[PDB]
A paper describes a structure:
VARP binding regulates VAMP7 participation in SNARE complex formation and can therefore influence VAMP7-mediated membrane fusion events. VARP has been shown to interact with Rab32/38 via its first ankyrin repeat-containing domain (Tamura et al., 2009, 2011; Wang et al., 2008).
We were able to crystallize a 1:1 complex of the smaller VARP fragment (residues 451–640) with the GTP hydrolysis-defective mutant of Rab32 (Q85L) in the presence of the nonhydrolyzable analog of GTP, GppCp. Its structure was solved at 2.8Å resolution by molecular replacement using VARP ANKRD2 and Rab7:GTP as search models. The final model comprises three molecules of the complex in the asymmetric unit, where VARP (residues 452–618), Rab32 (residues 22–198), and Rab32’s bound GppCp:Mg2+ are well defined in the electron density map. The three complexes in the asymmetric unit all have the same structure, with root-mean-square deviation (rmsd) values of 0.32 Å (for 306 Cα atoms of molecules A and B) and 0.33 Å (for 313 Cα atoms of molecules A and C). VARP ANKRD1 contains five tandem ankyrin repeats that form a slightly curved stack. Switch-II (residues 84–97) also stabilizes the γ-phosphate but differs somewhat in conformation as compared to those in other GTP-bound Rab structures. The VARP ANKRD1:Rab32 heterodimer buries 1,530 Å2 of solvent accessible surface area (calculated with PISA; Krissinel and Henrick, 2007). The elongated interface consists of a central hydrophobic patch of residues from helices α2B (L513 and L514) and α3B (Y550 and Y551) of VARP and residues from Switch-I (V60), interswitch (F62, L69, and W80), and Switch-II (M91, V94, K97, and Y95) of Rab32. Flanking the hydrophobic core of the interface are two salt bridges formed through Switch-II of Rab32 (D480VARP-R93Rab32, H517VARP-K97Rab32) and a third one through the interswitch of the GTPase (K546VARP-D61Rab32).
Author numbering:
A (entry chain D), C (entry chain D): 452 to 618
B (entry chain A), D (entry chain A): 22 to 198
The structure:
C-alpha cells in the first residue's frame, strides 16, 4: 500500500501541508511525484507555500515554487505567502518570492486591511525586507483601507528615512 | 524500583494512534481529526506493584512518517510497540506489515531479538470493512512476530487499558531476563 | 575536493550550524558523517541544536539529539536549546527535548536571569509547553534572580490556574 | 526594449561570491565573513544602449550547497553563470570543475547547449597560492567550456565591472539568435 497525497484532516491539511510545515523537502519531492496538489488550500485558505513562508523555510519555499506553486493565493485574511514572510521578517523567503518568479511578481496586492507587503514590513520595521521590496519596485504611495501609505506605517525615523531614500 | 519505557505507536494515517494515546492518558476523545505533525509524545504513569512503578513514554508517530527518513531516529532504543490499524479500512491492515518491517528492520532488544509488538484493531465500535475472523488475525500475529492483538476503541474506551497492560508485561519480562 | 566540516565564518558558524538553521537534514547526516563537531559553538555560545530549537525544526532537533548533541549547553545568556524552544513556543521541539533523553533531562537549569524553562513558558503564556513541562516534573517553587517563582511569572489567571492544578 | 537575466554565482566557500556581488551592486566591501545561508539574491540595473537596458538577477549560491540537493532548483532557467575561486587557495580551483559539472549537468539554453560560464580568479590583491600562468588558465577555459576569465578583487574593485560586461554580451548574443 502506497501513499495517498489527497488525504485531508478536518482543517483541510494535506500531507503536503504537513511536509511543508515540518521542512521535510525529500517528502515534498515524493508527495508531488505522487500527484499531490501543490496549491491545495486548508480550511483558512493557506497553501503549503503559505506555511513554509510563515515558518521561514527558504529551501521548501523554493522547492514549492519550483513545483509551480502560486505565490498570489490569498488566505482568509487576504495574505499571500509574501505577506506572511514580511510579517515575520523572513528576508531569505521574501527574496526567494521576489526573485524566483522572474518579474511576474506583484508587490501591490492588498490584504484584508489594504496592506501591501511593504506596509507590513514598514510596520514591523524589517529593514532588509524593506530594502529588497523597494529595490524591486514596491510602491510607497499605495494606501491601505485606513488610507495610510507605507511611509506612515514606519516604526521609526530610521526606517522612514530609508524609504524616502528611493522616493 | 521504578522504570522508564520508550514505547512506539505506529500505523497508517487516520487510524487512531493519537486518539488511543489521548484516551489512555487523559480519558478524552474527539471526533475531530488533526493530523499529527511528525512526532507527538505523552507520558503515562503506572502503579504496577507496590514494589514497582512504570513510566511509559508514548511516541506517537504520524502515519505519513514512513515515507520520510526519520524512523530510524524515532525507533532507537524503543523497548515495545503498538502497531495500529483501522478495522473499518482494510488498506490500513495491508499496511501494518510495512510498518512492522520498518520496525524490525531498525530496532532489536540488546540481545539482537525484535522488540515486543502488539497489534490493535481500532475503531471496533464501527462496522467491519473486512470480514476477517479473530482466528485469522490470531494466525497473522503468530506468523509475523506479534505478541498479541486487541479490538480497541478510543471512542468507547475498549481494551486500551488491557492492551497497555499486556504489552508492559512482555516488556518487564525482557527487562528481568 | 570534498567538504570541510570544521570551517568557520567570523561568527563561528560551522556548516553544521548553517545546515541546521536551514533545515537541511540530509546535509546534516552528510556533515556528521564527515566528522562535523555536533556541539560546536558559535561566537555567542549557540550550538546547531540551539539554532534548530529556536527556528522550531523538530526533525532536525531530533536528528541532532540522535547524533549525540548535548541539550544542556548554555549560550551567552545562559539558555539551553530548551530555554529557546520555550521562549518561542515550539511545543513540538520542547517535547522532543524532554522525551528524547530518557529522563536524564534537567528542567531546573537557570538562565542568566535565573529563569528555568517553566518560568519562560509561564511569562509568554504557552499552555501546551507549560503542561508538557509540568507533566515531566518541572518545579513551581524554583525562583529566579528576581526571586519570583514561575507562578508569579504567569501571563493570566487562566495559566496560573493550570499551574496550581499540579501544585 | 528591456531584459531580465538570471545569473548564477557559484563556487566553494569563502571564495568571495557574496563580496563580489556586494561590491558590484553597492560598491561596498567588508573583511568580515558571514557565510551565506542557502541562497542570496541581488539586482543589478544596466543602461546598456539607449535602445536597451538590462536587469540582472544575481543568484548568490552558498558554497556548501553543492553537497545538498537543491542546485537543480536554483539553476533552473539561468542564462549565464559566474564560477569563482580563491586565487590564494588551490583547493578552491580543483573544485571549480565540480561546480561546472553540476551546472552543465542541470541547465542548457533552450537549444540544448550549455549556458555561458565565466571564471573568476578572485582576491588577486593577494599572493598566489599557486603559480599557474594566465596561459594555463586560458587553456583550461577552452578545454572546459568557459567563455572567459578574469583576475578579480572584491576588495580593490578589480575587473568586476569588466567581467560583468563580458558575460552580459555573451548572453545578449544568445538572446538575439
Ligand atoms: N469511531 C471511532 N473513531 C475514532 C477512533 N479512534 C479514532 N477515531 C477517529 O479517527 C480519526 C483519526 O484519529 P487520530 O488519532 O487523529 O488518527 P491518527 O492515527 O493519530 C492519524 P495521524 O497518524 O496521521 O496523525 C479522528 O477523527 C478520530 O476521532 C475510535 O476508536 N472510534
Ligand atoms: N582580500 C580580499 N578578500 C576578499 C575578497 N573577496 C572576498 N574576500 C574576503 O573573503 C571572505 C569571504 O567572502 P564572501 O563573499 O563572504 O565569500 P563567499 O563566497 O560568499 C563564502 P560563502 O559562499 O560560503 O557564503 C570575506 O571575509 C571577504 O572579506 C577580495 O577580493 N580580496
Ligand atoms: Mg496522530
Ligand atoms: Mg556568501
Amino acid at each position: 500500500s502506497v501513499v495517498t497525497p489527497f488525504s485531508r484532516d478536518d482543517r483541510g491539511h494535506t500531507p503536503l501541508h504537513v511536509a511543508a510545515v515540518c521542512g521535510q523537502a525529500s517528502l515534498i519531492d515524493l508527495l508531488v511525484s505522487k500527484g499531490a496538489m501543490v496549491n491545495a488550500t486548508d480550511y483558512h485558505g493557506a497553501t503549503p507555500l503559505h506555511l513554509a513562508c510563515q515558518k521561514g523555510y527558504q529551501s521548501v519555499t523554493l522547492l514549492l515554487l519550483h513545483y509551480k506553486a502560486s505565490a498570489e493565493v490569498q488566505d482568509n485574511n487576504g495574505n499571500t505567502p509574501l505577506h506572511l514572510a514580511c510579517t515575520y521578517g523572513h528576508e531569505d523567503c521574501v527574496k526567494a518570492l521576489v526573485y524566483y518568479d522572474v518579474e511576474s511578481c506583484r508587490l501591490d496586492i492588498g490584504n484584508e486591511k489594504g496592506d501591501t507587503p511593504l506596509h507590513i514590513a514598514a510596520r514591523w520595521g524589517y529593514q532588509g525586507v524593506i530594502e529588497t521590496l523597494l529595490q524591486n519596485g514596491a510602491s510607497t504611495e499605495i494606501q491601505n483601507r485606513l488610507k495610510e501609505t507605507p511611509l506612515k506605517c514606519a516604526l521609526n525615523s530610521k526606517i522612514l528615512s530609508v524609504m524616502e531614500a528611493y522616493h | 524500583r521504578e522504570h522508564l519505557f520508550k514505547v512506539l505507536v505506529i500505523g497508517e494515517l487516520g487510524v487512531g494512534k493519537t486518539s488511543i494515546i489521548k484516551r489512555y492518558v487523559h480519558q478524552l476523545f474527539s471526533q475531530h481529526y488533526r493530523a499529527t505533525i511528525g512526532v507527538d509524545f505523552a507520558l503515562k504513569v503506572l502503579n504496577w506493584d507496590s514494589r514497582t512503578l512504570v513510566r511509559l513514554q508514548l511516541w506517537d508517530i504520524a502515519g505519513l512518517e514512513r515515507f520520510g527518513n526519520m524512523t530510524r531516529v524515532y525507533y532507537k532504543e524503543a523497548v515495545g510497540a503498538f502497531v495500529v490499524f483501522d478495522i473499518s479500512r482494510s488498506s490500513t491492515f495491508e499496511a501494518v506489515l510495512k510498518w512492522k518491517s520498518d520496525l524490525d528492520s531498525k530496532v532489536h532488544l540488546p540481545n539482537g531479538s525484535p522488540i515486543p509488538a502488539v497489534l490493535l484493531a481500532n475503531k471496533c465500535d464501527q462496522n467491519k470493512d473486512s470480514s476477517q475472523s479473530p482466528s485469522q488475525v490470531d494466525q497473522f500475529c503468530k506468523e509475523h512476530g506479534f505478541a498479541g492483538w486487541f479490538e480497541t476503541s478510543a471512542k468507547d474506551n475498549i481494551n486500551i487499558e488491557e492492551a497497555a497492560r499486556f504489552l508492559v508485561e512482555k516488556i518487564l519480562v525482557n527487562h528481568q531476563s
